[PDB]
Design a protein around this nucleic acid. Structure first.
Lengths: 70, 117, 151
RNA sequence: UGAGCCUUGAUGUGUAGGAUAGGUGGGAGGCUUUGAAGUGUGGACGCCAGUCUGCAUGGAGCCGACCUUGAAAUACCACC
RNA sequence: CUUGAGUCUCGUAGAGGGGGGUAGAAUUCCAGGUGUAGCGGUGAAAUGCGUAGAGAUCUGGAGGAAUACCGGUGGCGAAGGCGGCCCCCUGGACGAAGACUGACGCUCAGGUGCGAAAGCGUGGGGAGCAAACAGGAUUAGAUACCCUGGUAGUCCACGCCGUAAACGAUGUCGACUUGGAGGUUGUGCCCUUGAGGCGUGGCUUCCGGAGCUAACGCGUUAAGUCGACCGCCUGGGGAGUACGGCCGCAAGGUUAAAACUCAAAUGAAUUGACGGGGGCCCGCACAAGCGGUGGAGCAUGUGGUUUAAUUCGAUAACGCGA
RNA sequence: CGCGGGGUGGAGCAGCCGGUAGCUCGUCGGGCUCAUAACCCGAAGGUCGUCGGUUCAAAUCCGGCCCCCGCAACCA
RNA sequence: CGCGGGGUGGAGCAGCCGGUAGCUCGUCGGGCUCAUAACCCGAAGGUCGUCGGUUCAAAUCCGGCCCCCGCAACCA
């Protein structure tokens, strides 16, 4: 996330750009994931469970949407 | 001491404590300050406010070097990441580059074990 | 309370000067529903203060108040294992009341003989920026400053 | 890089105060064309009031007991 | 004889296996520069490292291990498992057409092989992590959880071990039975007039019909409808233990009882209750305030003790029946 | 017999100069606690084995005795 | 005996010119805190061993004494 302040650019804007760049990089998240060790099984489990959750969110709620609430 | 116009700010932002270190462009450190050293302990030094005042202190320290331009490198995750640089800005330097300088391995060393809490 | 905020009840201004703040002060001073005495005491003090400092009665009282009003106080959140005091900006209605209560406690504490006289001394001190109420005010500020990291 | 020394320069806030008074003795005027007061500032010290001093400009005066003070002039002086 | 089974031809994708090279990031250490009082850690600390110059920061070097992104209910493999690039050797799978062989097939007790992690042996290696261990915390205690360190091991070579919730808790092979939404990898045709249109094969994720099921659920990848072969079960404990055998360096594995003992033990689902589960909401529940009680003397009730008796009851009881 | 440790609040471990007279658990009260143990506060338990003495400070330094230890030696 | 360090607020470490009279823990108050230690604020404790003197600045420079150190030498 290397950044250079443009000529006649506000500081705050520059900071915002940097924050955006960092977010894009996923650096903080990267760090968080590497703080301590995750067992392979745990990693697998998380990935799978997340996928399951995603699929539920995609399909079951769509089905629910078809019917009106009131 | 020799005056220098342009230099670096290295911001080591940990979870527990922030460390600001101003240096010349070559690598030689001019001054430094810390949240722990700014009189912040435990809960209090792991905060953005602690970090900004540490940054302010560091800025004060390198007054005699008469630095004007500055590029910043931000290391690590912490609260004193945005707050620190804002504080630095306020202290009245021309911020030139903001760089993120976290060490990310490409899956090298095994981290320590997960805490059980 | 949980469910509904309610509008604050109506308060009449005091007969002598026609002011709400003074009436609130006398109310604060009062005890056992004894209003006439408490307001007599308040008046007596006020008269002594006016004599001492010159200015109007009211104006002097207001000045004394100003010197003991807090900008910020602290409250206990304690989300963590140990407790964390967090500063908070105190609102106009509250700050005035706090300063009143603080003056009255000081008056209670003082060593002088008559209640009105003690209150009068307390007001003089506040004007001068000594006393008890100003110290406590300072302590409140100091605590807030210490815990400024939290926001 | 440490550290002596012949020498010639600088350095010294009790409060009374012209204000950054080390002390003794010989003393009432020392310096000024081998260039005096006022101005521009380069580098030092600093108790932020100022002090010494380089170079430029200027060319005919600044400082004395003073009023005060336990001690008087860095008016010249030697001893340290 | 050619449908099953196999061979040949051309392609395809792949973390499939074995060997040998190499790249970059990051950690650790060493040497040196700058620099100055903290660093580190936690819920909060402390142990610990630091003015003998740490932490931070820059330069150079060493070494080990693993390969961010790509990366995906993606791929490959009999399973275990396999992930940076390159090269060498190598196994399988699938598709396209043809050509050939001509039942050569399926299953499999014994038998043989492969078989995570930990563990063992000998020799190497050793950055990080970390059983054991030590100290600091926490605690009533804390031989734990947390912190600071830290050795076996993890890594490599060659042997052994032969077990795991080695799981889809679902043996292998074949046939047949409504559908939808995908992923991946081929391939035929079609104006690819465009990322498309219509098919046809392989593997694969989810939902769901009939049917099945104790229900939960499974549902063309069956737990449906059938056939072939094998393995295994016969109440719970005792016990996957003892003895014996076989294997193993050992750890132990494997095979595998009995006495005795109970009338249960279990599975799915149901209603509640509970949770230091989650969401929403309320109450002088907290918060914000004012005044009390707890200390004093007395009144009064109770407990107790005492008494001849100190009436009996109440114990959301105790100025209560009274 | 001879020689080193010393003799305590229910048990134990008590800061070289003699003026400090203890801490854990324990029992009671109370406060919290759903409970208990925990946590907090406070409370009763001495001789300092003993006899004496140097000294206003003495159990606290010394002379003897009674025991608890430890000693290492002995035994016709 | 001679020679180097100097003698302080309950203990300790106090900025070359004599005008600064301290900081840690400690005790009390309060504020927070569930608790405690921590954190914050404020408060009582001096002689600067002593006797003197140069000087308005003195414990702060010197003459003697009392001790604490350190010295290194000695001992019929």
């Amino acid at each position: 996330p290397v950044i250079k302040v443009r000529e006649n650019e506000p500081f705050d804007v520059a900071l915002r750009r940097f924050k955006r760049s960092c977010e894009k990089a996923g650096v903080l998240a990267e760090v968080r994931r590497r703080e301590f060790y995750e067992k392979p099984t745990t990693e697998r489990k998380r990935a799978k469970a997340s996928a399951v959750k995603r699929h539920a969110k995609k399909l079951a709620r769509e089905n629910a949407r078809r019917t009106r609430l009131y | 001491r020799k005056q220098v116009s342009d230099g670096v700010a290295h911001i080591h932002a940990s979870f527990n404590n922030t460390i600001v270190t101003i240096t010349d462009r070559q690598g030689n450190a001019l001054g430094w300050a810390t949240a722990g050293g700014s009189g912040f302990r435990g809960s209090r030094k792991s905060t953005p406010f602690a970090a900004q005042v540490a940054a302010e202190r560091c800025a004060d320290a390198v007054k005699e070097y008469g630095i004007k331009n500055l590029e910043v490198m931000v290391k690590g995750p912490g609260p004193g990441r945005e707050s620190t640089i804002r504080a630095l800005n306020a202290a009245g330097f021309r911020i030139t580059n903001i760089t993120d300088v976290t060490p990310i391995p490409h899956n090298g060393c095994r981290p320590p074990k997960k805490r059980r809490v | 309370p949980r469910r509904r905020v309610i509008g604050q009840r109506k308060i009449l201004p005091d007969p002598k000067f026609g002011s709400e703040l003074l009436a609130k002060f006398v109310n604060i001073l009062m005890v056992d529903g004894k209003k006439s005495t408490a307001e007599s005491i308040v008046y007596s003090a006020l008269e002594t203060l006016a004599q001492r400092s010159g200015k109007s009665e009211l104006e002097a009282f207001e000045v004394a108040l100003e010197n003991v009003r807090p900008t910020v106080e602290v409250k206990s959140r304690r989300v963590g294992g140990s407790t964390y005091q967090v500063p908070v900006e105190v609102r106009p209605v509250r700050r005035n009341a706090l300063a009143m209560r603080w003056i009255v406690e000081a008056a209670r504490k003082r060593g002088d003989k008559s209640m009105a006289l003690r209150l009068a001394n307390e007001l003089s001190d506040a004007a001068e920026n000594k006393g008890t109420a100003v110290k406590k005010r300072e302590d409140v500020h100091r605590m807030a400053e210490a815990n400024k990291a939290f926001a």
